Amino acid sequence: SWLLRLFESKLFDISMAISYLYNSKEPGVQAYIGNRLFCFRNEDVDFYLPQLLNMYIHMDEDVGDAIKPYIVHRCRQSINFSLQCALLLGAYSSRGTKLRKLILSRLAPEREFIKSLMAIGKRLATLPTKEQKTQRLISELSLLNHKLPARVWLPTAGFDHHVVRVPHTQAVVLNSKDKAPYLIYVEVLECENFDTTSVPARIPENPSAVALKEPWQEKVRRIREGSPYGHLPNWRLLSVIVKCGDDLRQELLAFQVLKQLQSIWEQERVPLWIKPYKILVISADSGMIEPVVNAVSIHQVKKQSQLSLLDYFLQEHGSYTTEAFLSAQRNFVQSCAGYCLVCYLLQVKDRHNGNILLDAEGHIIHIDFGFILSSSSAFKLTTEFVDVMGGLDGDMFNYYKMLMLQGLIAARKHMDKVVQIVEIMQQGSQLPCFHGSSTIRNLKERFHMSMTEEQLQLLVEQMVDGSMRS
Template sequence: HQAKQSWLLRLFESKLFDISMAISYLYNSKEPGVQAYIGNRLFCFRDEDVDFYLPQLLNMYIHMDEDVGDAIKPYIVHRCRQSLDFSLRCALLLGAYSSDMHISAQRHSRGTKLRRLILSDELKPAGKRREPGGAGGGAGGADTGLSPSKRTHQRSKSDATVSISLSSNLKRTASNPKVESEEEPVRLAPEREFIKSLMAIGKRLATLPTKEQKTQRLISELSLLNHKLPARAWLPTAAFPHHVVRVPHSQAVVLNSKDKAPYLIYVEVLECDNFDTANVPARIPENRIRSTRSAENLPECGMGPEHRAGSFSTVPNYDNDDEAWSVDDIVELQVEEFSLGNPGVFPSKKALESWRCWEQESGDFPCGMRGLSLSAARSRRRRLSEQLAHTPTSFRRDPEDPSAVALKEPWQEKVRRIREASPYGHLPSWRLLSVIVKCGDDLRQELLAFQVLKQLQSIWEQERVPLWIKPYKILVISADSGMIEPVLNAVSLHQIKKQSQLALLDYFLQEHGNPNSESFLSAQRNFVRSCAGYCLVCYLLQVKDR
């Protein structure tokens, strides 16, 4: 017996002993000493390696005997003190796995107690303070480099106070100074309310009969949600720390489903260095976007600092005064003119910048617009057309499938378009994320499938097998709801056939050109690698419904 323990100890201390082996021994071993040792070894692994097996760890904590639970708990508590995101995922998984009715009262109680501990402020790190106020989303990159009087994006005066109700959990305290307090809020309260709001929207959409009604309701609901942003909330499916500042509600779409109403939203965030310590960004009103974008583009066209004085002051009401037109006003007129002559084609950001610079160099700005010669306008349009990249074919709008158009649009084009329309788009730390919100479905099995796909992907990469699969992230929120990471730049085969009325080969020819072109051959190769990968997955896992 001692010899066996000696060999086991040598294995545990070797470089071969990884997190997957630790989980296996923790599950299979019946010896409390081995379980306690592995519980301590969890602290030696990288956080991201342990995070991958978090569902298994919490399942063991809930379902297995007390020795296993006692071995796991110190690590869970330690990590929850270090990370808000880890705390959230633990609380959500504990709630989802504890909801099974067959679990005994004692085991259910243990998972519930740990969940309550995580949701309380007892695990808050001692001595942590918020960063001092500054511009942008907390990551020095959000500073626009302007003087304090000219910044359009200031920290909220005090984001430390958030009450438990939805109206104040998501609302920045800078806009409501009466509720300010010296106490820190419950750490996870704003994020939990943000998630609850998204889930509640999904449940209300499921009661509506048509896709068109669901889409209209979704847009109006998200518009209301925007009034409570920015907030100390984040998208757990993202890989970097950030604050949610805005949801472009008009871009949201309802996805295809017979009984449920899953929907896709795009979320504007400001990246920060440390979510736990960075202050919540201040709200920028929608009507500030024009003055902000105009001012930030002037230096790029040779305007000196003296010309920018007062650019970020309150915009006066000029009514119909022609002299009050900004660069963006004229650009918008030109965009309309260009779009009328070129249906379905929209200028790129680079092209718009060239327009702005042309206006500055013309020496007749802004009233010179009226005196532009036809030849100059044509010349400018020709230069713009040369700068535009090839625009892929788009899908037509279908009330029964509103997601087709949104999913067909190239991701980079969507990011550019939303950024230009956003009051936060001028900030360097601005990012666009997307997520699918799903209610009424158990995503715990989807989470397990994600783990299996990640393992297969890792094996194929190590062995240099040229297969491609995309394991998308799953966030389990409860036993019947969750969030899913969308696959970018992808539409379903059903949508392709319905919209194009073409065979797959003909569609590839339409999208990528000549069958001997580099674009077509690359797309064909990628499709075969992906199709082969998922065929092999379905065979190995014996998936019978595809």
């Protein structure tokens, strides 16, 4: 009864549940945990839905059958939940098929809303320039307002809601590529519960149309004021990037890892900073991303400003003796240390200033997580970055190294939670990041679990000095 003692203790959290579900080959354990899933908070389990569903698909029938009833139970009480299940099941098989059809057995408004959004993006392939694309996008988006409001929502939203309106004039396409992604803004009315309310009534509509580079809150103002629905307290504005021809499953995996490391760093008390950005997988081909607002690429910050990074900091925040600057510097240093650790641990490659965003407060944010782990340049610390930190002898730079060590010390103590996420996703995966046989082995080595702190200090120094050589 020593094992059952554990499972009945407070120790028992969704993580432990999933670990034993994954590792125990005892069918009685599997079934016991399958039953205890019901006992957890929805929010906590939600985070691991991809794992559960991956296991269902690629593992023993025993394992699948233990998980199913809980999933069915969730699916019955939330169509949002049903949707994500259906989307994920489909995406993670190219066993799955029979259940997807059973969940989809209603959701047509949403599925057709998404199909249309997908369809739009695919058409833009014939227009070779950004500007031409944006024009067709803007025109074609306007047609979708003709079907709103309806029983439709954005799964990437923090809350329950109904979508009412698309400010098409504000939408923009991001590059000149063959299957270019495009960004849109969407208007919604908040709910307390979606499943039991409304579908609110259409308001037929009638400057707010003009689009230019401005902060997020100034853009909310402009769109709100022009909007039929903008007066309501119920009203909120969302944003998504739509990727019609790009796989997002790596991107989803990265999200979970970032989110876990974030919680790890909050729980221990290391003030590193990172930004997980929400992912919605729609097919093996397609999905969406919630972008960070008030942020633009380092590369284009230097092409529109024509300045050095520091000079831009100084222009946009003030002299280094001002609060605004010292706070931004700190956010820079804390976001850099964070993302260094992530890049090292995940072996993030293809790192350049097109893939690094800078936000309004001075945090950086890395973004293109193609090329990670086993997949076949690395994280770099250019002297332009070191300059913003105040230089090699700077206090804040010493502190950057201090943070790196601290955050590594923290990670090591919660290693299992991180590895779990990746190890379960690898299961029936054909993804480039798992091309190796030793993906997980290499990942564990990178935690250096044998080391003393003094040893880690040295590793941090090596890492930093490595980041500067080029």
